[PDB]
Every structure is written in structure tokens, then in C-alpha cells.
UniProtKB/Swiss-Prot annotation, chain A:
Gene that specifies this protein: MCP
Subcellular location: Virion; Host nucleus
Domain of life: Viruses
UniProt similarity note: Belongs to the herpesviridae major capsid protein family.
Name this polypeptide is given: Major capsid protein
Full-protein positions shown: 51 to 99 of 1374
Curated annotation (Swiss-Prot), chain B:
Disulphide bridges, residue numbers: none
Compartment(s) of residence: Virion; Host nucleus
Assembly and interaction partners: Homomultimer. Makes the hexons and eleven out of twelve pentons. Interacts with triplex proteins 1/TRX1 and 2/TRX2; adjacent capsomers are linked together in groups of three by triplexes, heterotrimeric complexes composed of one molecule of TRX1 and two molecules of TRX2. Interacts with scaffold protein; this interaction allows efficient MCP transport to the host nucleus. Interacts with capsid vertex component 2/CVC2. Interacts with the small capsomere-interacting protein/SCP.
Known role: Self-assembles to form an icosahedral capsid with a T=16 symmetry, about 200 nm in diameter, and consisting of 150 hexons and 12 pentons (total of 162 capsomers). Hexons form the edges and faces of the capsid and are each composed of six MCP molecules. In contrast, one penton is found at each of the 12 vertices. Eleven of the pentons are MCP pentamers, while the last vertex is occupied by the portal complex.
Shown stretch of the complete protein: 62 to 99 of 1374
Species for this entry: Human herpesvirus 2 (strain HG52) (HHV-2)
The protein, known as: Major capsid protein
Family as reported in the entry's similarity comment: Belongs to the herpesviridae major capsid protein family.
Superkingdom: Viruses
Length: 49, 38
């Protein structure tokens, strides 16, 4: 008697690492680096017209 | 604590076209006459 229970398949999907500066909604925002924003109670912006 | 307190502006070009004539320099003046002959 000859018998075997065989293993035939294993597949992984790609996990797409999608950056924020790719999509079309990057246009409306100007993101910029500022550390220590946790330390302020106000860093808030004042503008003329 | 931030900038962007700036807007800019001007208005010319069409500001002479619709005006459709101009005399500058009115001095101390009392009466302006233009007569028509047709």
C-alpha cells in the first residue's frame, strides 16, 4: 500500500504601503513638521486681510 | 505664533477700457463748456 496526504498551496497577498503624498487629496493640505506640539496650549495662527 | 498674515491686490487694465476717455489735471476750475455743431 502506498499513501500520502500532500500539501499543495500557500499564497500571500501584498500589503500595499500607500503614502499620503500620493493621492489627490494631498493637494488641499500643506503638512509640515513641528515637534513638541504637545507642549503648547497655543501655537495658534494670526493673519491680516 | 505664525505668519501668512499677507494678501495682495491691484486693479488696472480694464480700469482704462470702459472709462473710454480721460482728461487728467483739473485745476482750480469753475465752468466746463463743450459745444456741439451738427
Amino acid at each position: 500500500d502506498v499513501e500520502f496526504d500532500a500539501l499543495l498551496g500557500s499564497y500571500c497577498n501584498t500589503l500595499s504601503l500607500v503614502r499620503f503624498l500620493e493621492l489627490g487629496l494631498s493637494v488641499a493640505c500643506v503638512c509640515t513638521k513641528f515637534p513638541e506640539l504637545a507642549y503648547m496650549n497655543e501655537g495658534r495662527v494670526q493673519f491680516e486681510v
